[PDB]
């Protein structure tokens, strides 16, 4: 069975066929409903897991992304997610196909765009095939998830049993706070995705708090997620896939035997996992 | 050939069961000069590389270490490497084997080494017998290795430049910090160990800088290296055949719901470890 909402992509007409389909993870069940292929395709992140032993083979376990953005990028280049205010200019939906556009308008609740699109479909043979029911089935799935999510999940967690704070622990990090308030603005679907993709800085287990990292890698944003340190220069991104410059001022050493000597020893992976926020669970 | 300093360690006794486990390290060669087993037994640390990335095939990766201190450990227990003033208190010398004690003393370069051990053996049959030859010969070899590692003078192996720094700005910005003083006092051997282990949070390339962590991992104390951070709580420590009665019941002959574990293991899994970052590095032409 397949569940990636982009795997649900369909064409109203004979031309395009989306022949770079969803990654196999679309058939998996993380409750993200996005193939990691699409995750890169639209946001430039990769998902990851952390196991956490409960002083046993038994574990609670958590899913976390890494971002895929370089050190030199700035502003919109560093944005990962927009506001409803600015997804339009961020993406140039027109360059995207109408199905993509309408899906985005569903996410952002853009009744006006929905109306415009339906009013254009009125005359189309795709509407003669009533193919709109593809969109409406996507809607049925989404809305069912929302009746399991938006009033549910965090809203169902209004109950004491659980709370996340995304605000920065360091009050000196002035850019926190207000964004953690804005968090309420975004669709609970998005809130679920972000929260199940971003590590907390701390977990309150009434047993004992744990601190998972010294300092948050990310920060809440005024419009949408941005790959940024709270402060200082950005940490080196592990960048990987015109006459311009490629200068890299290597060290001089020609030695190679050291590499074979050292391969036996811990090679620390270089990724940028996302850490932020105070997590709480009862019991 | 063997190169672990502790692989030398043997002593006179009725003992016929010397337990020196020294790892392939000793026949490897990358300037640690000591096997990981001794790093475990005495320093609760593991050897590593940072894969220093390069766009060029020449990645020129670099040495690293990570500690293993438990989150419950306190004070002296969190002290990673004591100062001369503290090691004798921290480690039960008498439980530790004699020669090992002497080696520690000499690594601290204390006169007390000869003040005590070189005299006190007089009564021993081992001091009387040929094994005194073996003992002081191992002493000589150790002193040789120490002098090899000694950087202090031009009439030696070491020469020219050094550029590493530590004691990087405290958040609360308390002025300075003797940690360099400690560095100097510590034998150049220990300094080389620090160079092997301690990554800087920033590398200032000649005309460029890169940053690699939000915040420092470690702090330094005149009493010794501290497994601690200036602020907040201690981080979570990453935790570490005969016949038996416990033979299992039959259960479902089925694999059942493994979707979650399978997809998680298809995802990459985090390397939950504690790299030691403390200090600053620069480069210039």
């Amino acid at each position: 069975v397949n569940r990636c909402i982009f795997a649900s992509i369909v064409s109203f007409d004979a031309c395009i066929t989306y022949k770079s389909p969803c990654s196999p993870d679309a058939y998996h069940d993380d409750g993200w409903f996005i193939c990691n292929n699409h995750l890169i395709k639209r946001f430039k992140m990769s998902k990851m897991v952390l196991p956490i032993f409960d002083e046993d083979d038994n574990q609670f376990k958590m899913t976390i992304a890494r971002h895929l953005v370089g050190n030199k990028e700035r502003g919109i280049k560093r944005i990962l997610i927009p506001s409803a205010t600015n997804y339009q200019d961020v993406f140039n939906l027109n360059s995207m196909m109408q199905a993509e556009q309408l899906i985005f308008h569903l996410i952002y609740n853009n009744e006006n765009a929905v109306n415009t699109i339906c009013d254009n479909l009125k005359y189309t043979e795709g509407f003669t095939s009533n193919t709109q029911r593809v969109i409406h089935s996507v809607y049925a799935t989404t809305k069912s998830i929302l009746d399991t999510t938006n009033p549910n999940t965090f809203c169902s967690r209004v109950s004491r049993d659980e709370l996340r704070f995304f605000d920065v622990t360091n009050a000196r990090a002035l850019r926190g706070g207000a964004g953690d308030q804005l968090f309420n603005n975004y669709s609970g679907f998005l809130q679920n995705l972000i929260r199940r993709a971003v590590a907390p800085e701390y977990l309150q287990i009434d047993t004992e708090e744990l601190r998972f990292r010294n300092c948050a890698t990310c920060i809440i944003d005024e419009t949408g997620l941005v790959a940024s340190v709270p402060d200082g220069p950005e940490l080196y991104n592990p960048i990987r896939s015109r006459l311009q410059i490629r200068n890299v001022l290597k060290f001089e050493g020609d030695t190679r035997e050291l590499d074979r000597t050292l391969s036996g020893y811990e090679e620390y992976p270089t990724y940028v996992p996302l850490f932020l926020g105070y997590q709480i669970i009862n019991s | 050939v063997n190169r672990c300093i502790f692989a030398s360690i043997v002593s006179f006794d009725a003992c016929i069961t010397y337990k020196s486990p020294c790892s392939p390290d000793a026949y490897h060669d990358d300037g640690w000069f000591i096997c990981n087993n001794h790093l475990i037994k005495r320093f609760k640390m593991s050897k590593m590389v940072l894969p220093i990335f390069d766009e060029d095939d020449n990645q020129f990766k670099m040495t690293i270490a990570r500690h293993l201190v438990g989150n419950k450990e306190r004070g002296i227990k969190r002290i990673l490497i004591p100062s001369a003033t503290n090691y004798q208190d921290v480690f039960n010398l008498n439980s530790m084997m004699q020669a090992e004690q002497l080696i520690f003393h000499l690594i601290y370069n204390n006169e007390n080494a000869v003040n005590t051990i070189c005299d006190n053996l007089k009564y021993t049959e081992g001091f009387t017998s040929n094994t005194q030859r073996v003992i002081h010969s191992v002493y000589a070899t150790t002193k040789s290795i120490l002098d090899t590692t000694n950087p202090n003078t031009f009439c030696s192996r070491v020469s020219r430049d050094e550029l590493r720094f530590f004691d990087v700005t405290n958040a609360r910005a308390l002025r300075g910090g003797a940690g360099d003083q400690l560095f100097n006092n510590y034998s150049g051997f220990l300094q080389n160990l620090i160079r092997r282990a301690v990554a800087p949070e920033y590398l200032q390339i000649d005309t460029e800088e890169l940053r690699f962590r939000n915040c420092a991992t470690c702090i330094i104390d005149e009493t010794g290296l501290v497994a601690s951070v200036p602020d907040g709580p201690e981080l979570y420590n990453p935790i570490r055949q005969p016949n038996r009665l416990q033979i299992r019941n039959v259960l479902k002959f089925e694999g059942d719901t493994r979707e979650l574990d399978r997809t998680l293991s298809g995802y990459e899994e985090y390397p939950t470890y504690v790299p030691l970052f403390l200090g600053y590095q620069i480069i210039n032409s």
Binding site: - | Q241, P242, N243, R244, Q246, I247, R248, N249, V250, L251, F253
Partner: protein, 52 residues
């Protein structure tokens, strides 16, 4: 199947030689040679008791 043998590497043994020899001496008197014929005959009769 009615159980799961863990079925990995397992062998039991015990080593209390003095204990074992004490056992031996406890066992010594019995004319096992004579006696065990009875058990053999038992198994034989069982061969027919098997079925009716």
């Amino acid at each position: 199947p009615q159980q799961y043998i863990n079925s990995g590497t397992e062998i039991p043994f015990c080593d209390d030689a003095e204990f074992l020899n004490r056992l031996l001496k406890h066992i010594d008197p019995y004319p096992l040679s004579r006696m065990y014929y009875n058990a053999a005959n038992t198994m034989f009769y069982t061969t027919m008791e098997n079925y009716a």
